Amino acid sequence: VAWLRVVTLAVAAFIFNTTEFVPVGLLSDIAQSFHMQTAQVGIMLTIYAWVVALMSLPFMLMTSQVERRKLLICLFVVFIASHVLSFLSWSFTVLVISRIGVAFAHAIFWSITASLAIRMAAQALSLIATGTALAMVLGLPLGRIVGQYFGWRMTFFAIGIGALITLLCLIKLLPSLPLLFRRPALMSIYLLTVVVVTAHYTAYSYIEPFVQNIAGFSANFATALLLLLGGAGIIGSVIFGKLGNQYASALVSTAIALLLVCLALLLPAANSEIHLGVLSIFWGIAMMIIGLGMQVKVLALAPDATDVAMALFSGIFNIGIGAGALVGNQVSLHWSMSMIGYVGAVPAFAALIWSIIIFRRWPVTL
Ligand SMILES: CCCCCCCCCO[C@@H]1O[C@H](CO)[C@@H](O)[C@H](O)[C@H]1O
Ligand SMILES: CCCCCCCCCO[C@@H]1O[C@H](CO)[C@@H](O)[C@H](O)[C@H]1O
Ligand SMILES: CC(C)S[C@@H]1O[C@H](CO)[C@H](O)[C@H](O)[C@H]1O
């Protein structure tokens, strides 16, 4: 019952995190159906993200008063309704309105999920994280291939059904802030996160219309990279799993360094299928190391109020996604979408330094 009552959430984290990134493999399709240009559709990522940023904190506030599995139901219900609206969406406006619906559930979910794994008890958090992790590897790739044969609306409708079958699996298994603002080390971590995420989502958001409209390759080759990155992620995630309980500083910095490289070398490694592919192998490995790197450290640094740690982590993570989407959008629209790799490499340089600085300053851990 423990493993189940938690594996059900680990799955549940897979759904929410799967959803928000699926648009990355669906920009062309979504654009085609609405007679706009790829990058223009990129903003539904920012809108989503920034709603999760704005509401992660106020929503949990209001919601924590009354917080049974009841709340998960109403998330899932809204999640499921919104996803039905995406499928029916009769304008790119209606689509993005639907994305807010999801984001409202998203916002609330990810405040809560940190604790609940523990309340059914631990290492409940790896499971959650495994789900988080298995989103990039199975979720997003398979979401593209579905969007290939069947198109984007079915992809969105599909996910809505998961939420249900998992909701039903869910129902069968049932029953502050100034202190953190005054942990500079935690704040510094919250800082590093915001920045490095913007760096990565400058580029990663538009990788599809990049591999298609800019590097010239097939829409199959794009889908190919997305698989490679996900699995690259498995390597990355299991490098950490086995080696992140120590070495956390060094891994994270070298990772961020690796990311730096990849972002700079995006345009030069294009026109070299094998090149972009390796890039993908390294990029991916960096992505998960950095991604889990922060979650682990925030939790470490905030034992007495983990969920509020995580509530902040959630929101402040989503600033970076909207940031990177938007800057990625704007470079693509106004100067060239080839300079997304380079533009993003600027926030990544800063982060490398900030990384090394703060790990020197606070070597304490465990
Ligand atoms: C102040 C210097 C910036 C350093 C980063 C410290 C975290 C503060 C960022 O605030 C953000 O704005 C939202 C608006 O409501 C809030 O919900 C929530 O706090 C958070 O997502
Ligand atoms: C010279 C010493 C370097 C140490 C300073 C740490 C880097 C913090 C910069 O973050 C800024 O925050 C914005 C998000 O709000 C970003 O979008 C913006 O591009 C970036 O400029
Ligand atoms: C980049 C993805 C992991 S999204 C990210 O996951 C985090 C930890 O799993 C936080 O809980 C955020 O709420 C969520 O948006």
Distance, CA of 179 to CA of 122 (rounded, Å): 24
Which residues are within 8 A (CB) of 130 and not within 5 positions of it... i.e. 6 or more apart?
A: 10, 237
Taking the C-alpha atoms of residue 113 and residue 122, their distance in angstroms, rounded to an integer, is 13
Which technique was the structure solved with, according to the deposited record? X-ray
| CA–centroid distance, residue 291 to ligand 3 (Å) | 8
Of all protein residues, whose CA lies closest to atom 8 belonging to ligand 1?
316
Closest C-alpha among 35, 46, 136, 147 to residue 87: 147
> Does residue 17's CB lie within 6 angstroms of at least one atom of ligand 3?
yes
317 lines ligand 3 (CB under 6 A): yes
**Which phi-psi region, left, alpha or beta, contains residue 216 (left: φ > 0; alpha: ψ -120 to 50)?**
left
Quote the tokens at residue 200. 């990565």
Tokens of 167: 């909701």
Pair 347, 191: CB distance under 8 Å: no
Structure tokens at 255: 């990772």
Residue in 236, 86, 228, 232 with CA at minimum distance from that of residue 163: 86
Distance from C-alpha of 328 to C-alpha of 201, rounded to nearest angstrom: 7
Identify the residue whose tokens are 């996604």: 321
Long-range contacts of 253-256 (CB under 8 A, 24+ apart): 253/352, 253/355, 253/356, 253/359, 255/285, 255/286, 255/289, 255/290, 255/293, 256/196, 256/286, 256/290, 256/348, 256/351, 256/352, 256/355
218 conformational bin, left if phi > 0, alpha if psi -120 to 50, beta if neither = beta
Give me the residue label for tokens 């979504």.
30
DSSP code at position 136: I
What is the residue whose two structure tokens read 């648009």?
Answer: 23
How far apart CA 85 and CA 233 sit, in angstroms, is: 32
To the nearest 10 degrees (0 to 180), the angle between helices 124-134 and 92-119 is 160
* Nearest atom within ligand 3 for CA of residue 197: 1
Provide the token pair at 281. Answer: 């192998």
Residue 14 in tokens? 């897979």
* Residue 145: partners with Cβ closer than 8 Å, 6 or more residues away: 223
Spatial separation of the C-alpha atoms in residues 20 and 17, rounded to whole Å: 6
Find where tokens 């909207």 sit.
322
Structural domains of the chain in order of their starting residue, each with its CATH number = 1-361 (1.20.1720.10)
Instruction: Give the closest residue (by CA) to ligand 2 atom 7.
Output: 350
Rounded Cα gap, residues 237 and 235, in angstroms: 6
Q: Which atom of ligand 1 is found nearest the CA of 319?
A: 21
Radius of gyration of the chain (CA): 19
Cα–Cα dist 127/112, whole Å: 15
**Minimal CA–CA distance to 23: which of 221, 185, 179, 208?**
208
List CB contacts of 12: < 8 A, sequence separation 6 or more: 72, 109, 113, 131, 166, 170
Expressed in angstroms and rounded, the spacing between residue 122 Cα and the centre of ligand 3 is 19
Question: How far is 289 from 278, CA to CA, in rounded Å?
Answer: 17
Q: Do 81 and 101 meet the contact criterion of CB atoms below 8 Å apart?
A: yes
Dihedral-angle region of residue 143 (phi above 0 means left; psi in -120 to 50 means alpha; beta otherwise): alpha
Q: Is 338 helix (H, G, I), strand (E, B) or coil?
A: coil
Encode 186-225: b = buried (16+ Cβ within 10 Å), e = exposed: bebbbebbbbbbbbbbbbbbbbbbbbbbbbebeeebbbbb
How long is the chain?
Answer: 366
Nearest CA to 131 out of 237, 242, 240 is that of 237
Name residues whose C-beta falls within 8 Å of residue 214's C-beta, 6 or more positions apart in sequence. Answer: 270, 337, 338
CA angle 179, 180, 182 (to 5 degrees): 70
Question: What is the C-alpha separation between 108 and 71, in angstroms, rounded?
Answer: 9
Selection from 291, 296, 316 nearest residue 306 by Cα = 296
Please name the residue whose Cα sits nearest to atom 2 of ligand 2. 350
107 Cβ inside 6 Å of ligand 1: no
What's the burial of 232, exposed, middle or buried (CB within 10 Å: 0-12/13-18/19+)? buried
For residue 221, give the H/E element and its range.
Answer: helix 219-243
Measured in angstroms, the resolution is: 3.1
Q: Could you tell me the two tokens for 363?
A: 């070597």
As a whole number of angstroms, the distance between CA 81 and CA 71 comes to: 15
